[PDB]
């Protein structure tokens, strides 16, 4: 029995936040990698009504 | 273990003030560092020495979390308004972190990279990037040679990231 689920790592959402704020200043028109990854993962799902 | 939302609140407000000042002037953080290091005993007592080391490793940690822009600022405006806050940082590296946050006559892999990342950020954002980088790294032979002697050790780390 699966009984909800575990959180695990609010370290690693802070390690991301590092490198993101970094690339933010490093660039400052050209587009981000983030929405690429999002689109790939939503495509790799099923499209079903399931 | 208590606080890994409050250091996120800190990140919020620090990046905010970076942008507010980009509308030369020195950061309030280094003032707080000097206040607390002064208000410790200047006694040599091993209790006090260790208490100073502890407070400094916490300082080292807090800058690693916060942007690499607090050290070098961003957008070195001209060669005339130059080395503002880097001297603030150098004085700290000489006075304090060379004592405790060190090994082997050198600094930490971590802050070394945190500096060089921030350095190339503001410098490449500025014109004359190669020339102004060469300016601040000639200054370092006089004011805080620890950075150069750190980067000697931690080079096989930085060079890829820098390139």
């Amino acid at each position: 029995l699966v009984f909800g689920g575990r959180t695990g790592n609010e370290d690693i959402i802070s390690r991301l936040q590092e490198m993101v704020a970094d690339l933010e200043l490093q660039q400052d028109s050209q587009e981000h990698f983030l929405f690429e990854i999002f689109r790939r993962r939503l495509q790799a799902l099923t499209s079903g009504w399931s | 273990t208590g606080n890994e939302d409050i250091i996120s609140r800190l990140q919020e407000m620090v990046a905010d003030l970076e942008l507010q000042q980009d509308l030369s002037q020195e950061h309030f953080l280094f003032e707080i560092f000097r206040r607390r290091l002064q208000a410790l005993t200047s006694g040599w007592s091993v209790a006090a020495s260790l208490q100073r080391q502890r407070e400094l490793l916490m300082y080292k940690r807090i800058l690693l979390r916060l942007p690499s822009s607090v050290l070098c600022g961003s957008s070195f405006q001209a060669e005339q308004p130059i080395t503002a806050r880097c001297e603030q940082f150098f004085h700290l590296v000489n006075s304090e972190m060379r004592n405790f946050c060190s090994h082997g006559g050198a600094l930490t892999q971590d802050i070394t990279a945190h500096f060089f990342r921030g350095l190339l950020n503001a410098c490449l954002r500025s014109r004359d990037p190669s020339l102004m980088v060469d300016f601040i790294l000639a200054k370092c032979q006089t004011k805080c040679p620890l950075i150069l002697t750190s980067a000697l050790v931690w080079w096989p780390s930085l060079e890829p990231v820098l390139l």
Binding site: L1, V2, G5 | -
Partner: protein, 89 residues
Amino acid sequence: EPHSQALQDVEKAIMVFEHTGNIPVTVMEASIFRRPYYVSHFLPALLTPRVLPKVPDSRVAFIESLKRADKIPPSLYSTYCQACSAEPL
């Protein structure tokens, strides 16, 4: 298989419901318009004839939110409550 699939389906429902509140809405559609699937899914929403812990939790609040939603016909909830009571060598 709909006894195993139903489990993995309600798994997703609850771990969404954690990150949110207020009942992932795929499931509440499935309720009114997949009624036999609602009952083939609804089995693992009370297949915890198991030690109820002292503290309310995920599964607990999910079922609470459903009975507040006026769903869970009380027959199967009464079922849940009672089953939960639980030489040659």
